[PDB]
Structures are given as structure tokens and as C-alpha cells.
Amino acid sequence: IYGMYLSVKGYNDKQPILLKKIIEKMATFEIDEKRFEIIKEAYMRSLNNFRAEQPHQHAMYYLRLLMTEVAWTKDELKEALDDVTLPRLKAFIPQLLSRLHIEALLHGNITKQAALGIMQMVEDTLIEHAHTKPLLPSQLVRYREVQLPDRGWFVYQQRNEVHNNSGIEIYYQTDMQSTSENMFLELFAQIISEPAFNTLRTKEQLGYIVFSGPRRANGIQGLRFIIQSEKPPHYLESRVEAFLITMEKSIEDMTEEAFQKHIQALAIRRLDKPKKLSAESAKYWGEIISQQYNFDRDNTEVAYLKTLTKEDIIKFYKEMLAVDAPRRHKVSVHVLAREMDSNLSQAPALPQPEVIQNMTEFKRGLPLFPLVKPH
Amino acid sequence: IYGMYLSVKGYNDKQPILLKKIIEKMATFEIDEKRFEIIKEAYMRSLNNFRAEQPHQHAMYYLRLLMTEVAWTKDELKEALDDVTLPRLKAFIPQLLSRLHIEALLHGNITKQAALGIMQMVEDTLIEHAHTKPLLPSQLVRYREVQLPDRGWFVYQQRNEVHNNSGIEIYYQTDMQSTSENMFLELFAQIISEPAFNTLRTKEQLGYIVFSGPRRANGIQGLRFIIQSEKPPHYLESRVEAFLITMEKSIEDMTEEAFQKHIQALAIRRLDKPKKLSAESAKYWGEIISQQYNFDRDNTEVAYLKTLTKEDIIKFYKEMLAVDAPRRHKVSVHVLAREMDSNLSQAPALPQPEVIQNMTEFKRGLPLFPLVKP
């Protein structure tokens, strides 16, 4: 959504050669017509084939659409696809390349001089063949995430046309990333991690797919649940809310040490060393594309984690997650089975949800979060 | 910032003929090179000539940059101006016209059939000559306004290189437009309107230009002060703040009848009928471009206005404007004189402001308001 991504990996003996051919071809590309028609046809089919994705992929997709300032739907792209001609693409390519900014991570068995060399080879190739000039600092747009109002609940409902199963995703948006908000949310996810599998899947058989954990996008974060089931969504909702309350009660009732076990387990996971080159590359690249550049984040966050108490999580929960929390921000995506119509612990009363009819109106009527500050 | 604007006014006897020539030429324009070079050069100079504008024009301009999500500076435009060649423009024009949405207000001595006729003439001419197709509903971006944090004060400072006066603008952003917030702000502006001229100019002689009133942009609003002076900005700040306190005290102390006089006066001001065609057109166009479409807003708001009391305004002020207000949102633009360096009633102690070093960082680091619902 920001441009283009290129990654070359492997033995570096011949690596500058491959990279150089790619960039040369990138910047002077001439489209063969038969090939264009064929690949266009393939892309068209892949746009259509979305209706046959899994219910949970759908739920994630719609949540993505809902939460980003600007996001084009598969439908809009498909529709827009027919006005794509050979001339038009040929005209698009030089314009795309006329102004660029490049952010690169070069990591492995290479020297500083060789890195500078490679970088400068890329810059020079782009200048030579596409006449690229710099972009203005202010044109480096990042998109923000829709900021949900205190105490609101929104539902977005859609039908899966292929599968006779449902999917649900439930998102409790918390706030901007920072040391403490991150370890609170992560600790909570850690604590509820195994109880959720054992209750929601093994005992209650809510579905084959049952997932829970942190969601992070556009510098904001929160708690998400993804489930795929034969049972209808409103029931799934009620079971997740009941689970959440059982969980708060369980966190209140638990001893200091079980709590410290959760801390120690989250801690080892977070401080866990990359075991091969490309995993370390992945971590740093993650720090870079999000523009947070927090390369020492694991130690900071773990150090802070060890400081945390039962109290902290209890009040976090009371502020942000409980059904009557002063800052609850809940959005739910319901993907209905083709056919569905529109003992156990006690499910709490939920407010009347607001049903979202139109994404643009929904977005227009809400604030946007800041972007996260670098380091 | 949204595209292009066309207004044709006058006797309607021949108006569709002029209109048809304009749009047909719009959609089939062929650029003469000499003209391009000449006009480009003129534009370059006009971009440069901003440095010689008045200090208060500068202050308004920078506040505009600060408060809008997206805004290109005159400097950035100037820089970007050099990559404009004949080929690039020739290619740009058909592309600009390739996808459009048109919102029109036709108002005057014309029939519905004639309106549909004119609209359809425009559409067909554009289709014929520029191959225009419709824009997608989702591509109708409006820009939002930066939402300032509770209790903050930010200052942005710049120097005017030409004029040996300073200018300041102070903006107290309140919240989104709605009937009550609007009449609170408007009543307050109305009440403080003349005391401010008489105190800050006539008595204290802070400068020739002294202005106050509602600022409305991008569906958001607030209270603004604009001043141009020989006096240094920090002093202007302290004097405006002292004035605001004088005003609160004065509003507390005033009688029921004086209060109703202010109400009645705001009421008359708001209910003033446009006296000629183009003023009514301007009013409707204002209702349309903001996409609020509140055509009967004047009556709703005046009716509601008559209901308000001293108490309400005192607590509004206490909530949004006072120095220790829980929801103060203050931004200031300081334009220093070329030469300038970087009793009276009692000015309150003010906090240390946060100095904006770079507009983009400032914007990136704050939330954005919603757009107003239609």
C-alpha cells in the first residue's frame, strides 16, 4: 500500500549481479502485449476467487478495510480493472518511477563500503534509466487507524457465499503502542492464551479454528479473537464475553506466583534469540517498515514486564476490556454461513450494537489516531 | 484543493453559449508554448511575492497549514514548479479530466428543464471531448482538521523579511459544529466583539489591526484573535489573555437585559437576509461545499439562541477558554518583524508553550477530527 517491496536473499557471491539486472529491468521495462493480456486475466481471476476464501480470512479482510483510513476493496479493484489498457500501463510506469524514496536494510556478510556501493548502484540505475528525483518529506504519507469511541460497540455483518460455516473476528482496540500498553496487552494475551484453547475449542467445541492474541496495525494495537464455527455468530459473541469475564475473575483469584509464571513465559518468548539470519532480518525489517525503529525493543519491554503486577492487569482490564469499562472500544466482524439467519457460565448483558451499513460513513464519522513517533 | 471551480454569472439570455465555449475549450485545450513559458514565469514570481504579504496574512496562512491534514506550502510549490514541462502538462490535462465528479448549484431566473439541460450539456460535452467517466463514491476525500490535545498550548514562530511590524494569531479550538456549540461560540464572539476593539486598540493601542471572531474550517470551529503590532508577540499574548479574563468577569457581572440585548443583536445579525442574488448564491454554495447542507441553519440556530442564559455561557467559557480550562486547546502563530528579536488589568501567569519546530511532525503526532455528517 506504500509502493513496492524487493527482497534478495542467499549467497552474496553473485548477489550484486542479480540485484542489478532486476533494477535495470524494473526501470526500463517493456511490456509484451500477449503476456500483459494473460497476466491481466490471471489477476482478474484472483480478484474473483476471493469469495471462496475461508470465513476467518474474510473477517480479517473486512476488519482491515474497516480500520485503515484508505483501503480499496477487492470489488473496487476488480471493477476498476477493465479501464486498464496497454497504453495506460505504459504511461503509468514512468510516472510511478519519476519520484521515489527508498528505504533499505542490507544485512549479512557485506561491508559498509559494499553496502554503500550497492545502494549507490541502485540510485544511479534509477536516475540513469528513469530520471528519478527525491520525494518531499511531507509526501511520505502513512495511513492512520480509525479511532473508536469510548463505550461503543460496532458490528459489521456480511455473508460468505461459498462455505456453510461462519467466521467471527472480535476486536477490542486499546491505544497507541508504548512500553506499558504493549506489555499489558501482551501479558493479558499470554494469560488467556491456554485457557481459551481448552475452553473454547476442546470443551465447548466452538469451532475448528479458535485463535486469540494481540493485533497491531498503524501504530495502534488491541486484543483480537478469530473463530470459525458451525454455530451462529451472536452465540460466539456471547461465549467470548462470558469467557472474558471468567478470565477476569480467574486473574483476580490467582496467586502471585502463577502470575509470575506467565510473566516468565512471556519473557523467555520475547527475549528468544533469532536462530538464523533471515529471522533477525525479519525483526529489523519489522522495526523499519513500521517506522518505529525500536531495535532494542525486546529488552526494554521485558525489563518493564518484570515490574508488572496482578494489580496492573486487573485495572487495565477494568479500564479497557470489561463490558462496563469506561474506555471499551469494541468492533466485531460477523461472517455468516451461507444458510444462517439474521452447565455454561453466564453471558453478560451486552449493549445494543450499532450495525455498520456503509464503510465510508462509519470512517468519516470517527476520529483518526496519531502516527507513532520514531526513536 | 478539491479540483476546479467555475462560476458564470449575469444575464441568462446568452449564458449557455458562454458556458458551452468554456467547457468545450476546457476539454480540448491546446497549449501554445510561448504562453506556457510566460505564464509559468508569472506564477513563479507570484509564488515568490508571498514574502511581501502582511504579517497577519502570514499568520492566517500558517494557521491554515497547521490545522489542515494536507496543505502544500508556497515554497514547496515553487520548488516543484521547475519539473513542469510542456510534455508533462499536455499529458496531465486529459488525465485530470479522465475521471470526475461534478457538484453544481444553478440559481436565478432559470427553469428546472433548463437546469437539467445545462447540466446535461456539460456532462455530454465532457464525455465527448475528454472521455470523462464517473468517480467512485469512495474517492471523494475531504481533508480533516488536526485535533489539539486537552490543556495544551503550541506556538509556531516565523519571521517576516519585508515588513517592520509583527503579527500574531491565536486560535482556541473548541469542537465540532452543532447547534449549541455554534451558538455558544457565536454568542461569546458577539459579546466580546466590541469590548475587544475598544480595549485592545482604542485604549491600549496594541496595533491598527485588531480582529476577533469564530474560525470555521473543515467542519471544526473555534475562537480566534488576529493582531498586527509594533509590540512583541509575547506581550500581545499576555494582553489577549488578560482581556479574556476581564471578559469573563464582565459576563458574570452583567444584567439579564444587557444579556438579552447581546442575544437580540446576534439574532438580527444571523437573520439578515441576503440583499442581492450572488450573496444568496454564496450562502447556498457555502452550505454545499462543506457538505453540511444545513440550509435552514439560521432559523434553527436563532430559535435555539434565544433559549440561552448567562449560566450556560459562563460554564462554556470555563470549560473551553479559561487559562485553567480542562479542555483548553490553544495554538499561536507568531510572525516577528524583520527587526524584531527571537494601570493595565492583570495578565494571568501562563504555562511554558510547546514550540513547533516542524509542521509535519506536529501533524503526524496529533489525532484528526471526524468530518461533519451531512
UniProtKB/Swiss-Prot annotation, chain A:
The keyword Zinc-finger does not apply. Its main location: cytoplasm. Keywords: Allosteric enzyme, ATP-binding, Cell membrane, Cytoplasm, Host cell receptor for virus entry, Host-virus interaction, Hydrolase, Membrane, Metal-binding, Metalloprotease, Nucleotide-binding, Protease, Receptor, Secreted, Zinc. Detected in brain and in cerebrospinal fluid (at protein level). Changing residue 144 to A: Decreases dimerization. No effect on degradation of ANP. Retains the ability to degrade an aberrant form of ANP, when in the presence of both ANP and the aberrant ANP. The modification N6-succinyllysine is found at residue 74. It is found in: Cytoplasm, Cytosol; Cell membrane; Secreted. GO terms for biological process: amyloid-beta clearance; amyloid-beta clearance by cellular catabolic process; amyloid-beta metabolic process; antigen processing and presentation of endogenous peptide antigen via MHC class I; bradykinin catabolic process; hormone catabolic process; insulin catabolic process; insulin metabolic process. It comes from the Eukaryota. The keyword Endoplasmic reticulum does not apply. The SlyX motif may be involved in the non-conventional secretion of the protein. Plays a role in the cellular breakdown of insulin, APP peptides, IAPP peptides, natriuretic peptides, glucagon, bradykinin, kallidin, and other peptides, and thereby plays a role in intercellular peptide signaling. Substrate binding induces important conformation changes, making it possible to bind and degrade larger substrates, such as insulin. Contributes to the regulation of peptide hormone signaling cascades and regulation of blood glucose homeostasis via its role in the degradation of insulin, glucagon and IAPP. Belongs to the peptidase M16 family. This is Insulin-degrading enzyme. The gene is IDE.
